[PDB]
Amino acid sequence: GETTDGVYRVMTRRLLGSTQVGVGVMQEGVFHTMWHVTKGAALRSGEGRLDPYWGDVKQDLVSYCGPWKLDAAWDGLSEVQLLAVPPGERAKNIQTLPGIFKTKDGDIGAVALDYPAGTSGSPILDKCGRVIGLYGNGVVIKNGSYVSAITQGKRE
């Protein structure tokens, strides 16, 4: 299959036509998405098969072909870009200064951008192009608008 670095759409044909269920990042031979996109299912890349390697429903992350490789983090200060990959639409950078998820267990970055559910797994970047996390697990606020965590895994 295609193992070239970059951002990919996650498609299914089980439903009407071909539906985008989410997005992921290929880096160092490993494919990175959010758990709620694939629910841990195997994936196809042309004729090649991607098998799940690691996954955590509570982090809402999953990796294919190898361990989680993305270990860059928001600096707590600088603007970021969401490389949004919406269904039927070309990849599009959106620059933003993230808000904050405050939890009993510490502070998480949050990006206040609403996009369709099928955009889940689009990468959030820093100014050096490193992926600081994935878009698409968050919360609908007092207003009715969506805020996503910046969800990043651990590199062992």
């Binding site: 955590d56 429903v57 870009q81 490389l83 620059q95 951008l113 919360v139």
Partner: protein, 39 residues
């Protein structure tokens, strides 16, 4: 059966559409990975 299709390089693009705010939110995380607002 799900399949992947490439969509782009991962690059910072100078002078991209700047938007969205920076809300500070008190949230909880349950065992199913659902974020909720604590009020």
């Amino acid at each position: 059966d799900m399949y992947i299709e490439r969509a782009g390089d991962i690059t910072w693009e100078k002078d991209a559409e700047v938007t969205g705010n920076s809300p500070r939110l008190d949230v909880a995380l349950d065992e199913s990975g659902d974020f909720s607002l604590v009020e």
